[PDB]
Design a binder for this molecule. Structure first.
Ligand SMILES: *[C@@H]1O[C@H](CO)[C@@H](O[C@@H]2O[C@H](CO)[C@@H](O[C@@H]3O[C@H](CO)[C@@H](O)[C@H](O)[C@@H]3O)[C@H](O)[C@H]2NC(C)=O)[C@H](O)[C@H]1NC(C)=O
Ligand SMILES: CC(C)CCC[C@@H](C)[C@H]1CC[C@H]2[C@@H]3CC=C4C[C@@H](O)CC[C@]4(C)[C@H]3CC[C@]12C
Ligand SMILES: CC(C)CCC[C@@H](C)[C@H]1CC[C@H]2[C@@H]3CC=C4C[C@@H](O)CC[C@]4(C)[C@H]3CC[C@]12C
Ligand SMILES: *[C@@H]1O[C@H](CO)[C@@H](O)[C@H](O)[C@H]1NC(C)=O
Lengths: 20, 219, 91, 196, 80, 98, 102, 15
């Protein structure tokens, strides 16, 4: 389950990178 | 698996000087029986080896077998075998098929503790009965177990936490076992018959170690 | 008789004592002592046999497929596949 | 007694019966389905105490009696009494209520958490309780199995007395062994592909 | 002895447990037992038994191989 | 010594020259194959040795352990097959850029 | 106890005028093969369940009833692996920032 | 396990 949030923060990281 | 008329041997052993060994029989639900022994009896046939041999066509076994071993003259603590169960089958031969029922998300959403139940598909006759196993390491905590068309009853239940069942890991190997021919089906003995119950994340991760290889190849 | 080679990735050669020698694909690969009753991989996909008796024993063949899932193009697995793949090779 | 059900934390009276005096063996057993019998006493001494356990003896009477202090769902098993064969004098079956919820789920419809007091295509199983040790919170449960006539949990337990507030959402709602640790490990190479 | 059961680690004692500095856990409903998510806990059978415990198999850890150790060092140096 | 064939995926059981080939699986319609081939369709992880014409199965000394999937119109899954998985990735990025 | 693996290293507290010897998982331990060896202060071992158990040092004669102190050290320790203790990932992170620092 | 990833990037990414 924690992997699905590993995703949710992975999309968080990719929107971080997109903002960067 | 014992088809009628065959012979089966199940072994018990001790290595810490138990001067008395015995075999016990338990009819599941209403029966407990003793089996004759010879350290130096119907329907059944060295101090470190203890053999049990079947040399009869008796169909009324329908029970679970236990091995005994204890000292003599001291307090008298009893040590017992894990258990053993046998088979009687007069083509038409069919060992009952076991099945797995995983809990749904409603139980973990409401109570946040899971419950695992596994079933063995039944038939007109009997002789299938004992408990089950788990994760290639028999857990001994929170274990629970246990008409028809005129052409026994056994279902097990386990109390699990929500954080405990979630994985495919903690693998539930449900098997009530007939331990151990002119039909297209395989021979009755076959092997251990079981129904088995996130690791797909690990498999996906090993898969994108493929990309971990692409990066090295590119560089 | 025999069938002393049996298969938490563990490989066993029971009923033996003293020096146990492990052969992988027929070649000398591992030594096992008396106090140890197990041998571990560390997919084995190998051909193995154990020598505690005269010229080893009955050999065993093993190979392991990782995905216990992946029966077919399962929707959840397919979704994971397509998302991971597309991001990984668009970069 | 019979399969007596009692709330958590009660003082117990579980008895044996024997008619022989030429014996030297007296022990108590907890029975699990697939785990055989494990022995839990040393009274082969009339008052031996080991944690929650206590016992009493009267070879003149012909009956033994055991006492459990603050009985737990671990007592929810058949308790037995110890030619040298283990002649089980009387025996007793016990179940303990983990009183403080009721709900039926669909998996195979699982009735559970009643806590009290509770035609061939549907099969049902009896009430059970068992020692849950991880969080030390327990639950009684029963499962109804059927494949024919497309059974629903509500009508499946139409015989059973579902408690007055049985939660019925019928149409609605640790890593180990290397590779997970590697997932925790190789995030370096997972992420350094940026820019690359 | 101490036991590992299901989700969490536990410390078992026949009497009350006294805690020496370490990873603090939570007390179970049983006063004589303790639960963990190191510390030294004294126990009695009378005789006194002191147990120091530290466990190795992780709900959160990392383990790898020297070739994979080479991998990780290569990765972080070129990630500099 | 058991090798597989790629096509229905087939598992083969080469043996000594025997007038009759016999199998021991570990009214099913999924259990059907020709020659020394063995094929499983809709394989199950439930309870589901092969020797030529003889007296006992002990002649085929070598035994086999298997925990895998046999399916139809499905890619092979193996340690080397991750490279096949590698192949589909740069193939599908080739598909995407076109 | 301070434990490191390069073969693992065990640490036993020093004692005044006392000989040193070891017991493992209620069984004896040498110091027989190369993996087992211990002569001056430390005990060298690791293989999963088989070698997991109690590790402690003993005196000559009064053992084992005298020693109320016993360590319960169960481990997996894969062959050729990494020193890493549960919460020590940040320490494992501490190692590679040092590499990144240099 | 997801604190490995929440630890910095979440708190860094929120603002
Ligand atoms: C059990 O297995 C171990 C595996 O290491 C054996 O150790 C090695 O044994 C070989 C012989 O099998 C030793 O080489 C030489 O053997 C003969 C004895 O007649 C002699 O030429 C030499 O004195 C020498 O020992 C070798 O040294 C040894 N190597 C290692 C690294 O341990 C062990 O001997 C075996 N035990 C037996 C066969 O009783
Ligand atoms: C987990 C395995 C596959 C390791 C590889 C990590 C991959 C999946 C990560 C690392 C670098 C990431 C990319 C970095 C930069 C960008 C640009 C941004 O505007 C959209 C997201 C995107 C395109 C990211 C997508 C996810 C990404 C490709
Ligand atoms: C570093 C990781 C997060 C790479 C980014 C890819 C993401 C989108 C991937 C990686 C791991 C994936 C998960 C791995 C395993 C499962 C279990 C499966 O039954 C349903 C999908 C699910 C839950 C996946 C969802 C998508 C997922 C989170
Ligand atoms: C032992 O010897 C014979 C003759 O060399 C050989 O054919 C046989 O396979 C051997 N047994 C094994 C390898 O188990």
């Amino acid at each position: 389950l924690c992997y699905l949030l590993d995703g949710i923060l992975f999309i968080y990281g990719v929107i971080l990178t997109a903002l960067f | 698996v014992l088809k009628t008329g065959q012979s089966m041997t199940l072994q018990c052993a001790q290595d810490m000087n138990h001067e008395y060994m015995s075999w016990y029989r338990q009819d599941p639900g209403m029966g407990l029986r003793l089996i004759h022994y010879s350290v130096g009896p119907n329907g059944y046939n060295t101090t470190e080896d203890f053999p049990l041999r079947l040399l009869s066509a008796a169909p009324s076994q329908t029970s679970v077998y236990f091995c005994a071993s204890s000292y003599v003259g001291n307090t008298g603590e009893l040590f017992f075998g894990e258990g053993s169960r046998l088979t009687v089958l007069e083509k038409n031969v069919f060992p009952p098929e076991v099945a797995v029922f995983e809990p749904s998300e409603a139980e973990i959403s409401h109570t946040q503790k899971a419950t695992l139940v596994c079933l063995a598909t039944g038939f007109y006759p009997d002789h299938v009965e004992l408990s089950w196993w788990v994760n290639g390491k028999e857990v001994h905590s929170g274990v629970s177990t246990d008409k028809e068309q005129p052409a026994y009853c056994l279902s097990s239940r386990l109390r699990v936490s929500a954080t405990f069942w979630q994985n495919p890991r903690n693998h539930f190997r449900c098997q009530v076992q007939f331990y151990g021919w002119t039909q297209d089906r395989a021979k009755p003995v076959t092997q251990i018959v079981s129904a088995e119950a996130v690791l797909s994340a690990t498999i996906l991760y090993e898969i994108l170690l493929g990309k971990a290889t692409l990066y090295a190849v590119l560089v | 008789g025999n069938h002393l080679v049996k298969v938490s990735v563990l490989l066993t050669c029971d009923a033996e004592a003293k020096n146990i020698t492990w052969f992988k694909d027929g070649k000398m690969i591992g030594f096992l002592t008396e106090d140890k009753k197990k041998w571990n991989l560390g997919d084995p996909r190998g051909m193995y046999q154990c020598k505690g008796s005269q010229n080893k024993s009955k050999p065993l063949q093993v190979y392991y497929r990782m995905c216990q899932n992946c029966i077919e193009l399962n929707a959840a697995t397919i979704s994971g596949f397509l998302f991971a793949e597309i991001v990984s090779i668009f970069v | 007694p019979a399969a007596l059900s009692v709330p958590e934390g009660e003082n117990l009276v579980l008895n044996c019966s024997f008619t022989d005096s030429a014996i030297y063996n007296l022990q108590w057993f907890r029975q699990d389905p697939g785990k055989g019998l494990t022995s839990l006493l040393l009274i082969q001494q009339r008052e031996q105490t080991s944690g929650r356990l206590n016992a009493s003896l009267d070879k003149s009477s012909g009956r033994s009696t055991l006492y459990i202090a603050a009985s737990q769902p671990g007592d929810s098993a058949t308790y037995l009494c110890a030619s040298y064969i283990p002649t089980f004098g009387r025996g007793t079956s016990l179940i303990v209520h983990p009183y403080i919820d009721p709900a039926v789920y669909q998996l195979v419809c699982l009735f559970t958490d009643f806590d009290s007091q509770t035609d061939s295509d549907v099969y049902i199983t009896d009430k059970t309780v068992l020692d849950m040790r991880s969080m030390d919170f327990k639950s009684n449960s029963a499962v109804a199995w059927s494949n024919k006539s497309d059974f629903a949990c509500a009508n499946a337990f139409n015989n059973s007395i579902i408690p007055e507030d049985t939660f019925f959402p019928s149409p609605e709602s640790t890593n180990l062994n290397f590779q997970n640790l590697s997932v925790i490990g190789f995030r370096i190479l997972l992420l350094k592909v940026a820019g690359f | 002895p101490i036991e590992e059961l299901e989700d969490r680690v536990f410390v078992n004692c026949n009497t009350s447990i006294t805690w020496v500095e370490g990873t603090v856990g939570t007390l179970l409903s049983d006063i004589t037992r303790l639960d963990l998510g190191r510390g030294i806990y004294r126990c009695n059978g009378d005789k006194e038994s002191t147990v120091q415990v530290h466990y190795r198999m992780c709900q959160s850890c990392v383990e790898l191989d020297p070739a994979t150790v080479a991998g990780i060092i290569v990765t972080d140096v070129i990630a500099t | 010594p058991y090798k597989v064939s790629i096509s229905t995926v087939i598992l083969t059981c080469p043996q000594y020259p025997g007038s009759e080939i016999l199998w021991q699986h570990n009214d099913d319609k999924n259990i059907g194959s020709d020659e020394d081939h063995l094929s499983l369709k809709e394989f199950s992880e439930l309870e589901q040795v092969c020797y030529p014409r003889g007296s006992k199965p002990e002649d085929a000394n070598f035994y086999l352990y298997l925990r895998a999937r046999v399916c139809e119109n499905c890619m092979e899954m193996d340690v080397m097959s991750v490279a096949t998985i590698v192949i589909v990735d740069i193939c599908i990025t080739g598909g995407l850029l076109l």
